[model samples]
Target: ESFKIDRSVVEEFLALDPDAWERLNADYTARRRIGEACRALSRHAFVEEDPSALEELHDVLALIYQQDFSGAPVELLGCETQPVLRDIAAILEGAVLAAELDSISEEQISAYPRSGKEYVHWLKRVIGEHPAAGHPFYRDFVPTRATEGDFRFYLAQETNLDPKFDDILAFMQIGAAPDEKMEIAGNYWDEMGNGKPAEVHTAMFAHALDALDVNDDYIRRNLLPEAKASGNLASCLAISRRHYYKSVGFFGVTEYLVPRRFKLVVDRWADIGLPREGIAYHDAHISIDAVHASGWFKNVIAPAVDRDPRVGREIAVGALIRLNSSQRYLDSLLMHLHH
Candidate 1:
């Protein structure tokens, strides 16, 4: 909490105007090449009916999504001075947004994290009691009896769509190529911008992180009730415990989905004349997700299931259902984007 902001890093970041950020984005060609490799892996993953293939796919994805297990290294800036960089952004952007307000010291911001739930509770109260109509996220709720919007529940469904998870199939309706299912890259760039890759990437990255946090909360608030009987795996655990082979099938498919989507993102970026960073995250995923897919199947899911067949079935079903739901959303977004 008391950590000092490294001044040099702050200055380095602050010096960048839109043009400089575009240069940084242009340098991402290597990143894009790596993305091509990852996309191949993702394609290999999506069509895989084999458990080992799924494992390979998940392993790749894990690396793509999170640098370290706890997820610190695989963060916003992918830099060591992340906290400080964010603080600088807050100051710079805040200064522009609210010039009349007094400057907030970085020290005061650091105190909130160290204060634990006490500070978090206050933060929640402030937002909860605030009077904005809330973000569009609050208004996009679909009326469906199927999904309760629980994070873990969604995750389990995502990984286990191989017959055991009907809920997932219900969501996606059918299994198709990831690219065919969705391609929001074009639409996202259209809305954000083509010239400013870093700016666009920054907004989407923050949005993704925020969405994950909300989804995590969704699991805690909505799905925890059945945790005891359901176990750590949640609803998917039930399907996994019932059907082992199918469960792994679903998990594998999820890993495979990442690459194809990445390709679309990269292609769109090129089409839009946006710098690679505008879509670098997509490039990063092409390889990283493949690695993650491998880990999920081989290291995590398979070994754990080998220990307990019942739990494995449950896990598989949940994973599939979650995948289907995600696929549905992606597909929907793609259609809307193109339109």
Candidate 2:
């Protein structure tokens, strides 16, 4: 527990503007704004030149980063791209990241891995008591007691930001070690349906969405800012080389986390008598990600740490970020599920 977030700087920054952190956690509208700004920032990450305006949009989005709870829109600052927007993008983005980083306790920060084996063992030990572990929505509610409406809502949120994993992995593939590249390629290949067009993970999730009429229209309505934050955090890391190692960390946790979640959802959907064929993506991922988690631990995460010790630290921090963000989203989603 001695090795914490190592935030000698973050500590100073948080005290400077306690208001920003308070606003971020309490202001639903504020979070929505920040979430979309991040989305616009991410979309523009690969937008037209697909680079020119993409960069231009980012140029401005970097300028600033907030919101309403009525369900936010995606193109919030895309057209505006002004420094005014850019500056807010900077604060909001900085605010959210710093807030999460700031909250890490001495206990949350644990062993910084010294070697590859420790990296693997360190992560397992970390998630063993993760905040998101045994999340009620998936483990108790959806699988056992929740209503059909809750299940439908779960579908939208599940797939809403799910595809980003594939996109994130693609980014993770870049600048990777040769051994790491093959490991990433293997993981990415499964997301891409192992070279088969129909089996593509998103496409299959789409099928599930389509079967239940929880398509884009439904997702747009049910979307939560916390949900968006979960994705944007990944997007911000995936898009920038500055946060590259963190992206590895974030994704490593993602692969580790998915198998059980997918299993529960798939199990619940079957119990509800939803289309069996539609959840192919979830079905496939249950086993696929189980293996991918191991692949990432040894191939990607472990290797990165093995080469440079700092990578391990960032990896741990990134995992913490995902845990914090995702747990918030789940808390929000679970509340919505009941009502």
Candidate 3:
């Protein structure tokens, strides 16, 4: 009952925006990517035969659709009449197609740590209730033009800290067993953009900072102290390999929650006339991190938890640590900025 649309109705909706619909259908590159995702998910469903798989598919599809077309440029869309219709059509049709493509059974899901479905589901549920969603920094600071300048101070601090992300991955890999290493390796490679320096995730963050003209001197003079303080968390986690599952949990939760946060940054920054190319960092993660979260759960955390159900509890602990740290770090910086 929660999902009301059917395939026939969805097709009719797509007809209203034939151009965007046709563009999506005819694009081989786009089709290939979606096709690959569908294939992976289908295979997972076949292996598990879990009822919750359909719900998971629906959730991922919803996120994909919400962030579709790099999210609706609400301000720009307000000036147009038909573009809004097109976006609605795209979103509706995409959701229906995803529903149709979902091949999972409707039977009750089993408690299988191998799939880690329960753990993944738990993480998603808690993330909805996360404090960061209602944090004063975003609620109070992100709404005004005057705050934009202050926000950049925070953004630069984050950027300055991001280059150590790969270090964290490397540290995680160091403690991982053979099976765990395989999953973490894939993530690390993706972070490095598969050896292409220009595509490195941190480099993308730096580019976004540069586009805002948040140069080295500006970062050092205005934000580096806070940057170093927040940056300490990454180094701490990376070195705390003694609690391996906790490390995995931290990474998983961060990946799971980041896309939504970054989606806001991308749209807000663009709304303020920031260069689109600069925020490519946030723009890329809006979709990529969703896939990463799914993959990390399937490939790493779930299997690790399967071997030792105790790891699930540890993972939960890690997620809590990350959520609390993120909230505290932002609140601290925001208070300082406002002061």
TM-score of each: 0.30, 0.74, 0.61
lDDT of each: 0.35, 0.67, 0.60
Return the candidate ranking by lDDT, descending. 2, 3, 1
Question: Is candidate 1 or 3 superior in TM-score?
Answer: 3
TM-score preference between candidates 1 and 2, better one: 2
Candidates sorted on TM-score, descending: 2, 3, 1
- Which digits, one per residue and each the tens of the lDDT, describe model 3 over residues 225-334? 33443344444445546657767877787788777777767777877877778877889888989888888877788778767776776676656666666675777777
Lowest lDDT block of 10, candidate 2: 62-71
Error of 2 at 119 (Å): 1.9
For residues 45-89, what per-residue lDDT tens digits would candidate 2 score against the true structure? Answer: 333224443333323332222121112345342322232233445
| Alpha carbon lDDT at 63, candidate 2 | 21
Report the lDDT tens digits of candidate 1 across residue range 21-128: 555455556334434444444344344434443334333322221222123423234344333332332332222212111222333223322232243233233323
Off by over 4 Å in 3: 1-115, 133-136, 143-148, 224-227, 337-339
Compared with the true structure, model 2 gives a TM-score of: 0.74
Better of 2 and 3 by TM-score: 2
Off by over 4 Å in 1: 1-204, 207-254
